[PDB]
Amino acid sequence: HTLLASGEDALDFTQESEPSYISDVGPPGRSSLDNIEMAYARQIYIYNEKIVNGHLQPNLVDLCASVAELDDKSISDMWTMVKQMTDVLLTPATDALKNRSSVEVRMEFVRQALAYLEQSYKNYTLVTVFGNLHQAQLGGVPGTY
Amino acid sequence: ATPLAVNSAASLWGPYKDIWHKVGNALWRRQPEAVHLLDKILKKHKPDFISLFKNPPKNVQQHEKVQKASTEGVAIQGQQGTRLLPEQLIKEAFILSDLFDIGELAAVELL
Amino acid sequence: LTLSQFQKQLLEDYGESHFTVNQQPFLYFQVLFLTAQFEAAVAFLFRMERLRCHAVHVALVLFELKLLLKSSGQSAQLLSHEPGDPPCLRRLNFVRLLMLYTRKFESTDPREALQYFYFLRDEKDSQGENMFLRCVSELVIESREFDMILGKLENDGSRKPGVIDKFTSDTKPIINKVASVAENKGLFEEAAKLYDLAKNADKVLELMNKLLSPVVPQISAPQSNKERLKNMALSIAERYRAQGISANKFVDSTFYLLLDLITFFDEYHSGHIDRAFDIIERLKLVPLN
């Protein structure tokens, strides 16, 4: 340090000169959002930019569900349920009340709701069996039977 | 005029007495010069009271820097340039981190 | 059993007092969502403090997937039923979901309040006014971030973009909507800046004449309302004369005559007196013979 702080006139090397290490970033004052609403707002930024730049419209379910792959398992399963209840082969009509009143789409909502409730009970029966294997007597045969 | 706001969430004592004494001067001493300070401090620290006693969380981007503080050194609010931290203060910061579940930078600001 | 009977039975005849909502809220959300009552499920979930963020993002999903039944008027409650819908369905006031969520951060995080209002890009009211243009015109009017949101004029009279230039290929209708709401709030210096930012050139001078009028005879002290409005009016006059701008000539000639009355008053207040004579005999506001 003493060899560089004796250096600027005859040793041709590093000065003690102003090093601008700090970049433009979201100011760490109070922004009144919280960690979760800021992660959601960031995923909405990551949604709107793709529409503004003329890209393919992304799935907003996966961009929102990746804010529940974080703190709260009950919000993660709530997003898993919202995903299964939005997995619907909707006719591209100009009218949401016609699609929500369709017989076909109301059958599809119940077909997905039953599939969710059945895989929920399949997860519960799996966890009940794997937690109690000595009672369960599962053996080497994979299948729901 | 930027940056530096980066780290004014990590101090687990300095800001909390800064609120408390200025609350006391505004209320129990009834001081007038403290009222346009109180408004600005309450419009600052509304997240803090919305999460009473909630720690700043641990982060790999703090963890790397605290472990590297014996070579690369760490930037501290108020202080010009990066402080080289002793291996003792580094090991003491990870101890406070896993004793309280506070962020690795917040453990260093507390030390 | 039809789905319509089961939807009603859970929402109306059992309800929030059967499903112990203050202890098992996700179970009542699940009961409504698996019965496809998505609007009622959101208008439930959005009541609870820690869950409003999810209730919005589920509504944004249901909106872009065009599943969300929309309530047909701004003034409606957060949930409604409309005079034409099957009696076991409900509708959400989607605008009123957003304007009760953005209103946590409208005055601190307005960059991202604009993003939540961009889902109103397509949306309109019963007058035909666009709900993105409306909600952004209420946002900027209380956040006051005019330079960042709406962009700026730099000293040449070019326009620097703001955050809003991501969301329209013309900002002029929005900037005039905000300038008009600022004028109706009496924010006349800000309305004048916004009318120049949109180059509604007459409306700038229609405000600067009113602003200079009670101020022209005042002493030009440092930081005074005279010295601010004087250098703002000169900044506009230099841009206008450099860009070849001229207006409704009764407003236009009033603007320059108020500027030369400021040079008359300042050359009088300096004690330079004979200069103020050499100005007023040119201005011919008074007779001398």
From Swiss-Prot, chain A:
Source species, domain of life: Eukaryota
Compartments reported by the entry: Nucleus membrane; Nucleus, Nuclear pore complex; Nucleus envelope
Biological function: Plays a role in the nuclear pore complex (NPC) assembly and/or maintenance. May anchor nucleoporins, but not NUP153 and TPR, to the NPC. During renal development, regulates podocyte migration and proliferation through SMAD4 signaling.
Subunit structure: Part of the nuclear pore complex (NPC). Component of the p62 complex, a complex composed of NUP62 and NUP54. Forms a complex with NUP35, NUP155, NUP205 and lamin B; the interaction with NUP35 is direct. Does not interact with TPR. Interacts with SMAD4 and IPO7; translocates SMAD4 to the nucleus through the NPC upon BMP7 stimulation resulting in activation of SMAD4 signaling. (Microbial infection) Interacts with SARS-CoV translation inhibitor nsp1; this interaction may disrupt nuclear pore function.
Disease tied to this protein: Nephrotic syndrome 12: A form of nephrotic syndrome, a renal disease clinically characterized by severe proteinuria, resulting in complications such as hypoalbuminemia, hyperlipidemia and edema. Kidney biopsies show non-specific histologic changes such as focal segmental glomerulosclerosis and diffuse mesangial proliferation. Some affected individuals have an inherited steroid-resistant form and progress to end-stage renal failure. NPHS12 inheritance is autosomal recessive.
UniProt family annotation: Belongs to the nucleoporin interacting component (NIC) family.
Protein name: Nuclear pore complex protein Nup93
Species of origin: Homo sapiens
Portion held of the full protein: 146 to 290 of 819
Curated annotation (Swiss-Prot), chain B:
Phosphothreonine PTM sites in chain numbering: 2
Residue numbers bearing the N-acetylalanine modification: 1
Tissue expression from the record: Expressed in the testis.
UniProt subcellular location: Nucleus membrane; Nucleus, Nuclear pore complex
Family stated for the protein in its record: Belongs to the NUP186/NUP192/NUP205 family.
Disease: Nephrotic syndrome 13: A form of nephrotic syndrome, a renal disease clinically characterized by severe proteinuria, resulting in complications such as hypoalbuminemia, hyperlipidemia and edema. Kidney biopsies show non-specific histologic changes such as focal segmental glomerulosclerosis and diffuse mesangial proliferation. Some affected individuals have an inherited steroid-resistant form and progress to end-stage renal failure.
Function, as annotated: Plays a role in the nuclear pore complex (NPC) assembly and/or maintenance. May anchor NUP62 and other nucleoporins, but not NUP153 and TPR, to the NPC. In association with TMEM209, may be involved in nuclear transport of various nuclear proteins in addition to MYC.
Assembly description: Part of the nuclear pore complex (NPC). Forms a complex with NUP35, NUP93, NUP155 and lamin B. Does not interact with TPR. Interacts with TMEM209 and MYC.
Name listed for the protein in its UniProt record: Nuclear pore complex protein Nup205
Organism this protein belongs to: Homo sapiens (Human)
Chain's gene name: NUP205
From Swiss-Prot, chain C:
Substitution effect: residue 195 to C: In NPHS12; doesnt affect nuclear envelope localization; doesn't affect nuclear pore complex assembly; doesn't abrogate interaction with NUP205; abrogates SMAD4 interaction; abrogates IPO7 interaction; impairs SMAD4 protein import; impairs SMAD4 protein signal transduction into nucleus;
Signal sequence range: none
Compartments, as annotated in UniProt: Nucleus membrane; Nucleus, Nuclear pore complex; Nucleus envelope
UniProt record similarity statement: Belongs to the nucleoporin interacting component (NIC) family.
Illness association: Nephrotic syndrome 12: A form of nephrotic syndrome, a renal disease clinically characterized by severe proteinuria, resulting in complications such as hypoalbuminemia, hyperlipidemia and edema. Kidney biopsies show non-specific histologic changes such as focal segmental glomerulosclerosis and diffuse mesangial proliferation. Some affected individuals have an inherited steroid-resistant form and progress to end-stage renal failure. NPHS12 inheritance is autosomal recessive.
Quaternary context: Part of the nuclear pore complex (NPC). Component of the p62 complex, a complex composed of NUP62 and NUP54. Forms a complex with NUP35, NUP155, NUP205 and lamin B; the interaction with NUP35 is direct. Does not interact with TPR. Interacts with SMAD4 and IPO7; translocates SMAD4 to the nucleus through the NPC upon BMP7 stimulation resulting in activation of SMAD4 signaling.
Function: Plays a role in the nuclear pore complex (NPC) assembly and/or maintenance. May anchor nucleoporins, but not NUP153 and TPR, to the NPC. During renal development, regulates podocyte migration and proliferation through SMAD4 signaling.
Protein name in the entry: Nuclear pore complex protein Nup93
Species of provenance: Homo sapiens
Lineage: Eukaryota, Metazoa, Chordata, Craniata, Vertebrata
